């Protein structure tokens, strides 16, 4: 078999779960896992432009294999946890950024 | 100077596209092909 380049014909026997739109949910299209937010997309794919990539070879767009719709893969907000304190000798209340 | 930091940052991103000798350059689909008993061999190459 070949992997991750040609359109997937032979595929696994799992139920076709309904799509969740515009919020951080997991996705799995033709065996491609990931985490992000799916949105309706500009940048019209050519009839055979199935997949999508970026500089880091990370997925940014995908099409529904059952409905002729073009989506985008965008990972939602994240970041680090930072704490602002005046010192244990001062008080206990703190600020988190 | 502003471009040099941007050019170094952009070049760092490009290196994520290389598998470093592994079967794939993406960690997402490696775990879906190898069990954790043997997934340590392939992922360790990408870690280094």
């Amino acid at each position: 078999f070949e992997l991750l380049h040609a359109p997937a014909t032979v595929c696994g026997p799992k139920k076709s779960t309904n799509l969740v739109k515009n919020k951080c949910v997991n996705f799995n299209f033709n065996g491609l896992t990931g985490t992000g937010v799916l949105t309706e997309s500009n940048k019209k794919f050519l009839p055979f432009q199935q997949f999508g990539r970026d500089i880091a070879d990370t997925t940014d767009a995908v099409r529904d294999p059952q409905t002729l719709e073009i989506l985008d893969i965008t990972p939602c907000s994240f970041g680090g946890v930072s704490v602002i304190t005046p010192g244990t000798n001062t008080s206990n209340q703190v600020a988190v950024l | 100077v502003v471009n040099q930091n941007a050019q170094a940052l952009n070049t760092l991103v490009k290196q994520l596209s290389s598998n470093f000798g592994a079967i794939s350059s993406v960690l997402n689909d490696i775990l879906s092909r190898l069990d954790p008993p043997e997934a340590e061999v392939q992922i360790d190459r990408l870690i280094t």
């Binding site: 970026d54 500089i55 880091a56 | 502003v2 941007a6 940052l9 952009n10 991103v13």
Partner: peptide
């Protein structure tokens, strides 16, 4: 070169000229 009260900020007539010459999606991918 002194700040002018025309623009809302205290930016000067040369600072905005300097601010426009050098520049920093490409930023979204990072």
């Amino acid at each position: 070169i002194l700040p002018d009260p025309s623009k809302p900020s205290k930016r000067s007539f040369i600072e905005d000229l300097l601010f426009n010459k050098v520049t920093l999606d490409l930023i979204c991918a990072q």
